[PDB]
């Protein structure tokens, strides 16, 4: 089972550096090439440089010579890319990929590292449960997560049991603070008769909070 697992989201301060990793399980590491790719607002994919691990031979795109630095660890079968002195324009998602010489393209990819280049300091979120305002058929009830930074923010309903009827809207920035909201629509049979909770986790501020939706 070919698996590429990269690093966690990074909040690097403007002018600092970070190293992104990519642990490769499921194939013989050297029999393939490791590439790196950049995705920036909605559309715009850029090749970024790449390295044949057998002879340690990297090859970059001119645009990225001097930002990206490839390296590999043959024993750990991981690949690492260092980015240096970042600016606002370097806030992007970085992907890790896999190439065999020409007999294909980039067949297996990585989950993606999201680097956020900013000086706003990590603030933890405020979770507020959105109780329903009368009911009839089915009730949608919600949950508002307001005022957090950086963006890796994970929200589950009923610890994941409730996977269906969910709408986890993406985050927006207002005055260097994000706000996220989520809705779940269930039957008048199922609520308030059962327990429904908004589970919010901001790993970056070591914040794990649960918030139950109540009628008042």
């Amino acid at each position: 089972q070919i698996q590429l697992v990269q690093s966690g989201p990074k909040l690097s301060k403007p002018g600092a550096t970070d190293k992104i990793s990519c642990a490769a399980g499921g194939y013989s590491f050297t029999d393939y090439v490791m590439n790196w790719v950049k995705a920036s607002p909605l559309k715009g994919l850029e090749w970024n440089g790449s390295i044949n691990t057998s002879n340690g031979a990297t090859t970059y795109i001119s645009a990225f010579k001097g930002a990206g630095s490839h390296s590999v660890d043959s024993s750990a079968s991981t690949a690492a890319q260092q980015l240096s002195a970042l600016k606002a324009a370097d806030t992007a998602v970085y992907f890790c990929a896999r190439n065999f010489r020409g007999n294909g393209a980039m067949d297996y990819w990585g989950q993606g590292t999201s680097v956020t280049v900013s000086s706003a300091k990590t603030t933890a979120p405020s979770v507020y449960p959105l109780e329903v305002s009368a009911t009839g058929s089915s009730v949608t009830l919600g949950c508002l997560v307001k005022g957090y930074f950086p963006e890796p923010c994970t929200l589950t309903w009923n610890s994941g049991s409730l996977s269906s009827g969910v709408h986890t809207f993406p985050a927006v920035l207002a005055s260097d603070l994000y706000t996220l909201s989520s809705s779940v629509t269930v039957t008048s049979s199922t609520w308030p008769s059962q327990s429904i909770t908004c589970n919010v986790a901001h790993p970056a501020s070591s914040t794990k909070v649960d918030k139950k939706i109540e009628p008042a």
């Binding site: 029999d31 090439v33 790449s50 390295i51 044949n52 057998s54 002879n55 340690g56 031979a57 990297t58 090859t59 065999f100 010489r101 020409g102 007999n103």
Partner: protein, 361 residues
């Protein structure tokens, strides 16, 4: 082929066709292992050095100088050349059969083969019909297939490069994904191949029995090797692929169904089969068929476990070339002298660093 009354012209031709054969297939991989520039230098020097040591053999079972530890010593290393060549014949007939047959079961590409329902990949399906034949020689009636293979093979290589051949860049000591450095630390691996490729010493005495002749012969031979080596290394599509992909049998950098290569493989298969039995008469002349099934068994076993043309040729050539090409012809000469000593010791040292440099990996 391989290692082992004339009006000079036919003498040079004969030395050429004898040293030509499946030996030329590994040259591209050798350059790649040293780097391009450093490899070219090595090919020239190693051509010149082996020529001097072949001269030396000409100026001389010999080996009275040593006796016992000399008579036996010449035999074992001469046996190393012979039995080592009977092994690589086995592997290459397998690959060529495999592709020659896979072709005739009912393609312009270059392949980076993944290193290791049709069951047509067997080296045992040829030992059964091919082992009695060396108990018997007449097979020398088909030496023309040696030239036919070499003729068609060279035609093949030129046709290919004309089609796709403009890809070079010069990363001198750094590396690129697609290009290897020009000076690579694996330069010893190239030297080992060349020793076995540049070896006629075991039979140059009988070959020259019919010196300007020899110099043109290795020059023609030496220049023949440099041609194939450079075309395949340069024409290897390098922006899309990489020059680290060059397989030790460069015909394996091509698919199972390259028609031109299949013609070359069929021709090489035709020629190669008409020459293995001779080595069986050759090995035993140097009382059951136990020895003689021993070399046959050695062929089959090698192709099924470790089938790299590159490692086999470099080790065997450096081994038998330690004595038969480097030290012994230099020892024969120096003792026969009952500044030059320093030079000839340096030749002795190269033959030593040749073998030791193959272990460094």
């Amino acid at each position: 082929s391989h290692e082992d009354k004339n009006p000079s012209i036919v003498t040079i031709f004969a030395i050429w066709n004898t040293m030509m054969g499946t030996s030329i297939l590994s040259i591209p991989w050798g350059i790649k292992q040293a780097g391009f520039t450093l490899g070219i230098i090595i090919i020239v020097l190693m051509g010149l050095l082996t020529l001097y040591c072949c001269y030396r053999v000409l100026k001389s079972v010999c080996k009275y100088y040593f006796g016992g530890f000399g008579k036996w010593s010449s035999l074992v290393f001469s046996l190393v050349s012979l039995i080592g060549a009977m092994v690589v014949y086995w592997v290459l007939m397998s690959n060529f059969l495999f592709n020659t047959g896979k072709f005739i079961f009912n393609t312009e590409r270059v392949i980076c083969p993944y290193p290791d329902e049709f069951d047509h990949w067997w080296s045992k399906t040829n030992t059964i019909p091919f082992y009695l034949i060396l108990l018997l020689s007449f097979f020398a009636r088909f030496t023309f297939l040696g030239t036919i293979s070499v003729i068609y093979l060279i035609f093949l290589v030129t046709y290919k490069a004309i089609q796709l051949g403009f890809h070079l860049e010069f990363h001198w000591f750094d590396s690129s994904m697609f290009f290897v450095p020009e000076f690579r630390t694996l330069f010893p691996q190239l030297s080992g191949v060349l020793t076995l490729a540049f070896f006629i010493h075991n039979c140059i005495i009988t070959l020259m029995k019919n010196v300007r002749d020899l110099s043109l012969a290795y020059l023609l031979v030496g220049l023949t090797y440099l041609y194939v080596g450079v075309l395949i290394f340069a024409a290897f599509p390098s922006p899309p692929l990489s020059k680290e992909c060059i397989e030790p049998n460069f015909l394996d950098n091509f698919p199972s169904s390259d028609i031109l290569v299949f013609v070359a493989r069929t021709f090489l298969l035709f020629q190669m089969t008409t020459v293995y039995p001779l080595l069986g008469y050759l090995v035993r002349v140097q009382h059951v068929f136990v020895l003689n099934v021993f070399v046959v068994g050695a062929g089959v076993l090698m192709a099924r476990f470790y089938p790299n043309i590159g490692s086999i040729i470099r080790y065997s050539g450096a081994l038998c070339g330690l004595a038969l090409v480097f030290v012994l012809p230099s020892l024969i000469h120096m003792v026969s002298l009952k500044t030059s000593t320093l030079f000839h010791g340096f030749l002795i040292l190269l033959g030593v660093a040749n073998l030791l440099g193959q272990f460094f990996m």
